[PDB]
Motif scaffolding. Sequence first.
Motif, PDB file in Angstrom:
ATOM      1  N   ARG A  65      16.624  30.348 -38.254  1.00 17.68           N
ATOM      2  CA  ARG A  65      16.230  30.927 -39.535  1.00 17.68           C
ATOM      3  C   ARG A  65      15.130  30.024 -40.089  1.00 17.68           C
ATOM      4  NH1 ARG A  65      20.185  34.759 -41.581  1.00 17.68           N
ATOM      5  NH2 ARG A  65      19.596  34.244 -43.728  1.00 17.68           N
ATOM      6  N   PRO A  66      13.917  30.180 -39.550  1.00 19.74           N
ATOM      7  CA  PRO A  66      12.883  29.166 -39.768  1.00 19.74           C
ATOM      8  C   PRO A  66      12.107  29.283 -41.071  1.00 19.74           C
ATOM      9  CG  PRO A  66      12.055  30.845 -38.306  1.00 19.74           C
ATOM     10  CD  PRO A  66      13.514  31.154 -38.513  1.00 19.74           C
ATOM     11  N   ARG A  67      12.299  30.355 -41.826  1.00 19.19           N
ATOM     12  CA  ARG A  67      11.535  30.558 -43.051  1.00 19.19           C
ATOM     13  C   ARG A  67      12.449  30.391 -44.237  1.00 19.19           C
ATOM     14  NH1 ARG A  67       8.091  29.522 -40.319  1.00 19.19           N
ATOM     15  NH2 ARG A  67       8.028  27.984 -42.030  1.00 19.19           N
ATOM     16  N   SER A  68      12.015  29.657 -45.237  1.00 16.08           N
ATOM     17  CA  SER A  68      12.905  29.374 -46.345  1.00 16.08           C
ATOM     18  C   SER A  68      12.309  29.764 -47.670  1.00 16.08           C
ATOM     19  CB  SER A  68      13.253  27.899 -46.370  1.00 16.08           C
ATOM     20  OG  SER A  68      12.071  27.142 -46.488  1.00 16.08           O
ATOM     21  N   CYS A  69      13.207  30.034 -48.608  1.00 17.85           N
ATOM     22  CA  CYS A  69      12.834  30.289 -49.978  1.00 17.85           C
ATOM     23  C   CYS A  69      12.312  29.007 -50.603  1.00 17.85           C
ATOM     24  CB  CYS A  69      14.050  30.742 -50.760  1.00 17.85           C
ATOM     25  SG  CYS A  69      13.673  31.018 -52.500  1.00 17.85           S
TER      26      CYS A  69
ATOM     27  N   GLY B 176      15.526  26.941 -51.260  1.00 21.54           N
ATOM     28  CA  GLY B 176      15.698  26.382 -49.931  1.00 21.54           C
ATOM     29  C   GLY B 176      16.500  27.233 -48.967  1.00 21.54           C
ATOM     30  N   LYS B 177      17.063  28.351 -49.421  1.00 18.77           N
ATOM     31  CA  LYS B 177      17.860  29.179 -48.516  1.00 18.77           C
ATOM     32  C   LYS B 177      16.986  29.702 -47.384  1.00 18.77           C
ATOM     33  CE  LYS B 177      21.226  32.914 -48.226  1.00 18.77           C
ATOM     34  NZ  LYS B 177      22.439  33.442 -48.901  1.00 18.77           N
ATOM     35  N   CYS B 178      17.520  29.632 -46.170  1.00 22.26           N
ATOM     36  CA  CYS B 178      16.759  30.011 -44.993  1.00 22.26           C
ATOM     37  C   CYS B 178      17.051  31.435 -44.553  1.00 22.26           C
ATOM     38  CB  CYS B 178      17.046  29.055 -43.845  1.00 22.26           C
ATOM     39  SG  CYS B 178      16.514  27.373 -44.187  1.00 22.26           S
TER      40      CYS B 178
ATOM     41  N   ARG C 201      15.471  34.667 -41.521  1.00 18.73           N
ATOM     42  CA  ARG C 201      14.946  34.799 -40.171  1.00 18.73           C
ATOM     43  C   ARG C 201      13.426  34.900 -40.129  1.00 18.73           C
ATOM     44  NH1 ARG C 201      16.643  41.181 -39.184  1.00 18.73           N
ATOM     45  NH2 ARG C 201      14.602  41.994 -39.858  1.00 18.73           N
TER      46      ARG C 201
ATOM     47  N   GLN D 225       9.646  35.825 -42.876  1.00 18.27           N
ATOM     48  CA  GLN D 225       9.090  35.806 -44.215  1.00 18.27           C
ATOM     49  C   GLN D 225       9.441  37.063 -45.001  1.00 18.27           C
ATOM     50  OE1 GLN D 225       7.492  33.011 -45.417  1.00 18.27           O
ATOM     51  NE2 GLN D 225       7.919  34.076 -47.345  1.00 18.27           N
TER      52      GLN D 225
ATOM     53  N   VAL E  23      12.787  36.418 -46.562  1.00 18.98           N
ATOM     54  CA  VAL E  23      12.618  35.509 -47.697  1.00 18.98           C
ATOM     55  C   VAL E  23      12.106  36.297 -48.902  1.00 18.98           C
ATOM     56  CG1 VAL E  23      11.349  33.569 -48.665  1.00 18.98           C
ATOM     57  CG2 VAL E  23      12.177  33.453 -46.300  1.00 18.98           C
TER      58      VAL E  23
END
Length: 60
Positions: free
Chosen positions: A32-36, A40-42, A44, A46, A49
Amino acid sequence: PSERPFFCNFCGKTYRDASGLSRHRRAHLGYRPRSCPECGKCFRDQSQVNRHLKVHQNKP
DNA sequence: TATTGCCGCAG
DNA sequence: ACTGCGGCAAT
Ligand SMILES: [Ca+2]
Ligand SMILES: [Zn+2]
Ligand SMILES: [Zn+2]
């Protein structure tokens, strides 16, 4: 006629196309490489997000 | 063969 | 409210 020829090698779940399988495999991996940027919540990708961001609006 | 944008379904 | 899921199209 509805073929689901793509499948997971650890649980056998089947997919219409490679995209569903890609996402499913990564879900098993916890990838889950993209985060808010706000909390910071990750997620899968963009797009997911972006959908999450409205959590941070003031409700109402 | 690969990844994600888009977006609907379901809980 | 919030998000896991996954089909389709594009790349
Ligand atoms: Ca669907
Ligand atoms: Zn699986
Ligand atoms: Zn957030």
